[PDB]
């Protein structure tokens, strides 16, 4: 029962932009937390890049589970957790954030906004709050009409890629991952 990432994004026609994020990498090895956090930012963006508007999805990896919600408007939200964390509480968390986010930030500050420009400090507070679902607010106005059982599940994040698309070329060419993080993934290319 752990939450790792909680980032709010935007899906423009040209690119997908990060607006505000929050991380919890205290469970990882100390000299890996920097690299790990970068991957969670890279994934959160990549999932939105492959997901369409007005749809929910949950890409699965071994011992990790990323949940994405893209509204009818191009405002998105990605939360990363483990296998134990229930998907319903994950999406419930995503909705209450994107509602408070549209309340504080204008709709034109979204397609060109940046984490240093966007103003929302309550992301790190919610990430630590919803760490235990038994200590989460029971919003029955939300989850009563969230599910449609049409939330696309993915066995890996390769299911979002094209037929000839290689994830190896996406990592090494990414501009969100550092040089030490790409080389850290190269030691992960040896199947760890």
């Amino acid at each position: 029962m752990k939450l790792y990432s909680l980032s709010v994004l935007y899906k423009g026609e040209a690119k997908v932009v990060l607006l505000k994020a929050a991380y919890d990498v205290s469970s990882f090895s100390f000299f890996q937390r920097s690299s790990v956090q970068e991957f969670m930012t890279f994934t959160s963006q990549l999932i939105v890049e492959r997901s369409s508007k007005g749809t929910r999805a949950s890409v699965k990896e071994q011992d990790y589970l990323c949940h994405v919600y893209v509204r009818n408007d191009s405002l998105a939200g990605v939360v990363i957790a483990d296998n134990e964390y229930p998907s319903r509480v994950a999406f419930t968390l995503l909705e209450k954030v994107l509602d408070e986010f549209s309340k504080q930030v204008d709709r034109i500050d979204w397609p060109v906004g940046s984490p240093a420009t966007i103003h929302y400090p309550a992301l790190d507070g919610h990430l630590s709050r919803y760490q235990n679902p038994r200590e989460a607010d029971p919003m029955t106005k939300v989850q009563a009409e969230l599910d449609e059982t049409k939330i696309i599940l993915h066995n890996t994040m390769e299911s979002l890629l094209e037929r000839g698309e290689k994830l190896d070329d996406l990592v090494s060419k990414s501009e969100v991952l550092g040089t030490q993080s790409k080389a850290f993934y190269k030691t992960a290319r040896k199947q760890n």
Partner: protein
């Protein structure tokens, strides 16, 4: 020049422990290439880091050096022995022979047994699953023990509970971690009725945050099975704790469905109730 560059590292690691006895964990630092006049042993706060470029040179040096000692091919000082076995086990805690040398050092009065409990702890922060580290640790504890156990024992038992718990958190369903924790309660605590109840309480919150951890929940079962045996007013609540457990389990299965661990747990609690 690798005979001097590497022999300097075992000093840098040794020095790090003397200027900082409160080191929390160790770890590997991504470094494809060395930098000018900088030791690969970098520590920030309590954390102790080792750059990866030196590992491929550091390990086989210390490895072969210990083998030359065991085969009487090259003599080492007892101070050199402690230094090489330390750096060797921080890189590979499964090297049984290296641990055995430290057993001999301890048994000869040369090495302080506390240093091995500390060395083992740091090894479990990078290798929480390592079988040999737990195996050796049991021998060290067995040497520290030559009715309620003494204060000295209870001081050590509480320490073992914490390192087992931290190792249980780094690797999901860590059998060797929980198996050792059980061993401690058997031999060190001698199944003390007070310690058993306290462990039943402190692990409630942890167990609810790790519902897919059969080893953690078996630990619960062990506590309950041992409490029944020890009872052969505080002992009165025997069916009370059992129904507290089945309520706690149900309260999780309802909250988090699809976990056969929780089901296997409750299924075993039913066995304990019916066989009183």
């Amino acid at each position: 020049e690798v005979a001097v560059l590497v022999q300097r590292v075992v000093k840098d690691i040794t020095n790090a422990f003397r200027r900082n006895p409160h080191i929390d964990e160790i770890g590997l630092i991504p470094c494809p290439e060395a930098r000018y006049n900088r030791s690969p042993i970098v520590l920030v706060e309590n954390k102790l880091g080792v750059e990866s470029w030196c590992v491929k040179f550091l390990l086989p040096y210390v490895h072969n050096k210990l083998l030359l000692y065991r085969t009487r091919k090259q003599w080492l000082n007892r101070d050199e022995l402690i230094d090489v076995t330390c750096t060797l086990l921080l890189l590979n805690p499964d090297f049984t022979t290296a641990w055995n040398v430290r057993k001999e050092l301890i048994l000869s009065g040369t090495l302080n047994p506390i240093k091995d409990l500390h060395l083992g702890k740091l090894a479990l922060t990078k290798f929480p699953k390592s079988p040999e580290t737990w195996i050796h640790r049991r021998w060290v504890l067995q040497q520290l023990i030559q009715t309620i156990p003494t204060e000295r024992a209870q001081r050590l038992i509480q320490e073992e509970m914490e390192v087992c718990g931290e190792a249980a958190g780094r690797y999901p369903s860590n059998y060797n971690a929980w198996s050792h924790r059980i061993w401690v309660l058997q031999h060190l605590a001698k199944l003390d009725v007070k310690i058993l109840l306290d462990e039943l309480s402190s692990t409630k919150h942890w167990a609810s945050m790790h519902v897919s951890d059969h080893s953690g929940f078996h630990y619960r079962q062990f506590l309950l099975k041992s409490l029944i045996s020890q009872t052969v007013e505080p002992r009165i609540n025997l069916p009370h704790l059992l129904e507290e457990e089945v309520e706690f389990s149900t309260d999780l299965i309802d909250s988090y469905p699809g976990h056969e661990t929780l089901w296997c747990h409750r299924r075993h609690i039913f066995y304990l109730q019916h066989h009183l």
